[PDB]
Design an enzyme around this catalytic site. Structure first.
Site, PDB file in Angstrom:
ATOM      1  N   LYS A 159       0.827  -1.329  -0.277  1.00 36.91           N
ATOM      2  CA  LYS A 159      -0.063  -0.173   0.070  1.00 36.91           C
ATOM      3  C   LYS A 159       0.844   1.312  -0.186  1.00 36.91           C
ATOM      4  O   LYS A 159       0.512   2.676   0.378  1.00 36.91           O
ATOM      5  CB  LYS A 159      -1.227   0.115   1.220  1.00 36.91           C
ATOM      6  CG  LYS A 159      -2.062  -0.995   1.418  1.00 36.91           C
ATOM      7  CD  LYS A 159      -2.384  -1.476   2.190  1.00 36.91           C
ATOM      8  CE  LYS A 159      -1.557  -2.241   3.366  1.00 36.91           C
ATOM      9  NZ  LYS A 159      -2.715  -2.800   4.822  1.00 36.91           N
ATOM     10  N   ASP A 195      -4.513  -6.766   9.891  1.00 35.29           N
ATOM     11  CA  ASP A 195      -5.664  -6.375  10.685  1.00 35.29           C
ATOM     12  C   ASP A 195      -6.763  -7.558  10.209  1.00 35.29           C
ATOM     13  O   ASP A 195      -8.371  -7.035  10.913  1.00 35.29           O
ATOM     14  CB  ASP A 195      -5.718  -4.774   9.615  1.00 35.29           C
ATOM     15  CG  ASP A 195      -5.420  -5.064   8.207  1.00 35.29           C
ATOM     16  OD1 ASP A 195      -5.720  -3.816   7.331  1.00 35.29           O
ATOM     17  OD2 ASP A 195      -5.123  -6.193   7.957  1.00 35.29           O
TER      18      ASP A 195
HETATM   19  O1  LIG Z   1      -4.911  -3.554   5.351  1.00 35.31           O
HETATM   20  C1  LIG Z   1      -6.003  -4.649   4.242  1.00 35.31           C
HETATM   21  C2  LIG Z   1      -4.544  -5.496   3.603  1.00 35.31           C
HETATM   22  O2  LIG Z   1      -3.839  -4.393   2.438  1.00 35.31           O
HETATM   23  C3  LIG Z   1      -2.660  -5.040   1.711  1.00 35.31           C
HETATM   24  O3  LIG Z   1      -2.912  -6.310   1.362  1.00 35.31           O
HETATM   25  C4  LIG Z   1      -1.627  -5.551   3.363  1.00 35.31           C
HETATM   26  O4  LIG Z   1      -0.522  -6.503   2.259  1.00 35.31           O
HETATM   27  C5  LIG Z   1      -2.176  -7.156   3.574  1.00 35.31           C
HETATM   28  O5  LIG Z   1      -2.040  -7.468   5.500  1.00 35.31           O
HETATM   29  C6  LIG Z   1      -3.606  -6.200   4.879  1.00 35.31           C
HETATM   30  O6  LIG Z   1      -4.565  -7.252   5.477  1.00 35.31           O
END
Ligand SMILES: OC[C@H]1O[C@H](O)[C@H](O)[C@@H](O)[C@@H]1O
Ligand SMILES: Cc1cnc(NC(=O)c2cc(Oc3cnc(C(=O)N(C)C)nc3)c3cc(C)oc3c2)cn1
Ligand code: NA
Length: 448
Positions: A159, A195
């Protein structure tokens, strides 16, 4: 103006927008490919090459036994940084949000964890408690290869995060070292959770049927309760362990190639992680609006939008925010919401332009809902099979601004999951302060 010409324009718009369409058979293909990649990630023989990492969390289905008291929770990776004080007896919460500076997310890991520790100090002063050493739960929204619940290495930033000296290191260690450099408080880091994991755990507290966590916000990911016999990376075949799919990386080995459009390649090429998180790039809020911006530029180029002229703001990276996709789709039919968004982007939109923008928005958000549904259905379908259930009743705990705030995403997604999950009864639950609560609940259970 001319009503025949306005119509011919909308018909050419549609012909271009038709490229976003996914048939039910395309979704089943995507689903079967996701499932194939999930099997691969779980097995010791294919794990290293698998794009879908199926990472063991060390969060286990446990008979119970929760500790009582105050637990501190950290939340990094979503929209800003969050510190939460959680009281377990019943669970009541106190929390604060901090905006992460760009120089910390794109500088060194030291700068990032230094700022994190500064925020922790500020939360503790505001609640008058920088003296109490509490058990701490860390929500860290990035792929981590765990050794235990409190020990795990960052595989790669996702991200847009780019802090140096983080990848290949123990995240709990980076955090602990930062707290020590500051030396103005003490915390015992007991658990580090994704998360998705925190969301499933806080949602489970409210509904014991919750065994799946899903995030559709800045990023897109899922976790679920896997049978220990299927978790080859962890010795043991008794009970269940939560697996972080890291499904955002699906398509990174070419699995989505036939579905990737020109807009998808451009978003990827101009991203901080090109060639990575390609499935996430089809759904996530960090990309959704940018995808709409790109489609609008294509329509300006074909002389179908804005008199063939794009403003400086329309040619600005990240200018068409994801919230504008949600807001355009909220529009009651009068076009007032669409108009104001376009006016603020330095455009002089006609009624036709507003309608075309509406269409580009729905084409991108409906594709995201459909791609996302193939993934959830694959996870749910696999679980039904692993548990050998005729009719599986499961609850999915969900967090994130795209699923929460987009006006039709949730409905298109549920309907598409339902079509792809026969013999499955799925309850969808939205988390009320998902992450923070979740990381502290795992901490109370772990703190024995
Ligand atoms: O935050 C939403 C998701 O974003 C990206 O896919 C991250 O790599 C993952 O760890 C997370 O759960
Ligand atoms: C080392 C280790 C290994 N596994 C775990 N495992 C866990 O912490 C744990 C906690 C869970 O959720 C809970 C949420 N709230 C509460 C609660 O009511 N509290 C008062 C906390 N309890 C459980 C769930 C739910 C599923 C499906 O698996 C779970 C594992 C934790 N630590
Ligand atoms: Na195992």
């Amino acid at each position: 103006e001319n009503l025949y010409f306005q119509g011919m324009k909308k018909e050419k718009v549609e012909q271009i927008l038709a490229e976003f369409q996914l048939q039910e058979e395309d979704l089943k293909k995507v689903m079967r490919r996701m499932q194939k990649e999930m099997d691969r990630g779980l097995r010791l023989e294919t794990h290293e090459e698998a794009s879908v990492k199926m990472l063991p969390t060390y969060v286990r289905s446990t008979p119970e036994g929760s500790e009582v008291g105050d637990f501190l929770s950290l939340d990094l990776g979503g929209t800003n940084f969050r510190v939460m004080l959680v009281k377990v007896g019943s669970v009541k919460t106190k929390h604060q949000m901090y905006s992460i500076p760009e120089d910390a997310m794109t500088g060194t890991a030291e700068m990032l964890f230094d700022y994190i520790s500064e925020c922790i100090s500020d939360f503790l002063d505001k609640h008058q408690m920088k003296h109490k050493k509490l058990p701490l739960g860390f929500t860290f929204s990035f792929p981590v290869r765990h050794e235990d619940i409190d020990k795990g290495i960052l595989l790669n930033w996702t991200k847009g995060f780019k802090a140096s000296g983080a990848e290949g290191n123990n995240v709990v260690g980076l955090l602990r070292d930062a707290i020590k450099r500051r030396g103005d408080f003490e915390m015992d880091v007991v658990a580090m959770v994704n998360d998705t994991v925190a969301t499933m755990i806080s949602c489970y507290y409210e509904d014991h049927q919750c065994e799946v966590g899903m995030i559709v916000g800045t990023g897109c990911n899922a976790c679920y309760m896997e049978e220990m016999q299927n978790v080859e990376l962890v010795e043991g075949d008794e009970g269940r362990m939560c697996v972080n799919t890291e499904w955002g990386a699906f398509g990174d080995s070419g699995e989505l190639d036939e579905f990737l459009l020109e807009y998808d390649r451009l978003v990827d090429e101009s991203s901080a992680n090109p060639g990575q998180q390609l499935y996430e790039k089809l759904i996530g809020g960090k990309y959704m609006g940018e995808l709409v911006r790109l489609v609008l530029l294509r329509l300006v180029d074909e002389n179908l939008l804005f008199h063939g002229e794009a403003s400086e703001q329309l040619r600005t990276r990240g200018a068409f925010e994801t919230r504008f996709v949600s807001q355009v789709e909220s529009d009651t039919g009068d076009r007032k919401q669409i108009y104001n968004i376009l006016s603020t982007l330095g455009l002089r939109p006609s009624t036709t332009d507003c309608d075309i923008v509406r269409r580009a928005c729905e084409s991108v958000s409906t594709r995201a809902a459909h791609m996302c549904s193939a993934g959830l259905a694959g996870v749910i379908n696999r679980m039904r099979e692993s548990r050998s259930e005729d009719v599986m009743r499961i609850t999915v705990g969900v967090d994130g601004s795209v699923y929460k705030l987009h006006p039709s995403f949730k409905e298109r997604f549920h309907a598409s999951v339902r079509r792809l999950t026969p013999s499955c009864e799925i309850t969808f639950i939205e988390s009320e302060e998902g992450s923070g609560r979740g990381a502290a609940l795992v901490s109370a259970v772990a703190c024995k």
